[PDB]
Amino acid sequence: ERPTFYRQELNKTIWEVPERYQNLSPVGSGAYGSVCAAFDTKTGHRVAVKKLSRPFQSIIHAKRTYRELRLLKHMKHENVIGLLDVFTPARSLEEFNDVYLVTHLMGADLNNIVKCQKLTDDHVQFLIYQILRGLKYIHSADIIHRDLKPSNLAVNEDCELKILDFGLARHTDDEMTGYVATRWYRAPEIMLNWMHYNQTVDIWSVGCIMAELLTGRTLFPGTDHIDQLKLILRLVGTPGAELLKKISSESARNYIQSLAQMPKMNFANVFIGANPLAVDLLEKMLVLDSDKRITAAQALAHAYFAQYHDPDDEPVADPYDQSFESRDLLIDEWKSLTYDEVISFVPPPLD
Numbered sequence: 001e002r003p004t005f006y007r008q009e010l011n012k013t014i015w016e017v018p019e020r021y022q023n024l025s026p027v028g029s030g031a032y033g034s035v036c037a038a039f040d041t042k043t044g045h046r047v048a049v050k051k052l053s054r055p056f057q058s059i060i061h062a063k064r065t066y067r068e069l070r071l072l073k074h075m076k077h078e079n080v081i082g083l084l085d086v087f088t089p090a091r092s093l094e095e096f097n098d099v100y101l102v103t104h105l106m107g108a109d110l111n112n113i114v115k116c117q118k119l120t121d122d123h124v125q126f127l128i129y130q131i132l133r134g135l136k137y138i139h140s141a142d143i144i145h146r147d148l149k150p151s152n153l154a155v156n157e158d159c160e161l162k163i164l165d166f167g168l169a170r171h172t173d174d175e176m177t178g179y180v181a182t183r184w185y186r187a188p189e190i191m192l193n194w195m196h197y198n199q200t201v202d203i204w205s206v207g208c209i210m211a212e213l214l215t216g217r218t219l220f221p222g223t224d225h226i227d228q229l230k231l232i233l234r235l236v237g238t239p240g241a242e243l244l245k246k247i248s249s250e251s252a253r254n255y256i257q258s259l260a261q262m263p264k265m266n267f268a269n270v271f272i273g274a275n276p277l278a279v280d281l282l283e284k285m286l287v288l289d290s291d292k293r294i295t296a297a298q299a300l301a302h303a304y305f306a307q308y309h310d311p312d313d314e315p316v317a318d319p320y321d322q323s324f325e326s327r328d329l330l331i332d333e334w335k336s337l338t339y340d341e342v343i344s345f346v347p348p349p350l351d
């Protein structure tokens with residue numbers, strides 16, 4: 001027996017939500033999901049409720065919808081976005097078509113903080129520590145964010161950070177073109193599709209964010225893919241034979257070999273005036289060869305986070321079954337798996 005829902009039209013959208021959600025008011029929306037803010041009388045939190053657009057209009061959308069629910073249902077870390085509730089007014093799979101997702105309402109992101117100037121080393125420490133702590137958790141479940149950037153990091157008045165907007169599911173093509181922030185935090189190997197990318201593509205992203213927090217400037221603000229690749233190599237140095245061997249495209253390798261070689265620059269002469277520990281860490285993160293990049297787990301142990309590092313308080317995730325990613329099903333099959341996931345949702349406890 002479900003709760004009582006109440007219909008209501010907001011900005012030309014019908015929202016059927018349980019009574020517990022009161023004072024709904026638009027807070028934006030995307031081509032992916034319409035979002036309303038509201039007070040959840042059950043928990044006492046202000047929440048963000050998203051009504052997915054056309055969750056099952058296609059197999060890709062049906063699958064993406066399914067993937068997002070599984071992902072959100074699995075994330076249970078204080079530095080990662082959680083699912084407070086998921087629901088559908090649908091009384092049966094027969095009528096199942098709408099999916100609403102609820103999470104803590106987030107005010108500002110990392111931009112509404114960096115964009116104001118450089119940050120104190122203590123703040124960069126804390127903010128990066130949290131990104132890596134959640135990343136350790138995300139990576140431990142064999143999940144790759146793929147889209148870490150300031151606009152995807154929620155930050156509150158007490159500098160408490162949460163990672164959201166998981167990459168997987170979205171494919172930002174023609175949005176990675178030109179002078180766009182969406183590409184400035186992308187690892188070179190994934191940006192030019194040099195090889196199959198690993199979890200450290202996320203570590204490269206943290207590096208760009210850390211640097212930007214220290215200097216107050218974007219690290220690689222390329223006007224396009226190539227301009228950006230040049231900015232990167234100028235700092236990091238051109239690839240060696242070891243790395244070249246790993247680039248699977250003969251064209252990419254050919255292109256790369258056309259570039260005059262460059263040595264790695266001196267980071268202390270780049271991040272002038274920065275805590276040497278921050279500079280050191282940045283060197284372990286901003287490594288061209290993804291194989292030799294530092295891991296989230298290893299970074300947390302770095303001496304730069306001595307003030308915050310606590311091995312007993314940097315949990316990993318429960319196993320995350322992604323076998324469905326290979327599963328080949330019909331729209332209706334994804335829809336039903338999705339409905340099971342909605343139906344089976346167990347909310348996180350209160351206190």
Ligand SMILES: Nc1nccc(-c2c(-c3ccc(F)cc3)ncn2CC2CC2)n1
Nearest residue numbers: 027028029035048050101102103105106
């Ligand atoms: N204010 C605010 N706070 C938190 C999350 C979001 C959020 C969610 C989103 C993601 C997961 C959910 F469960 C609900 C909503 N989807 C998009 N946005 C922001 C876009 C709407 C402006 N917006």
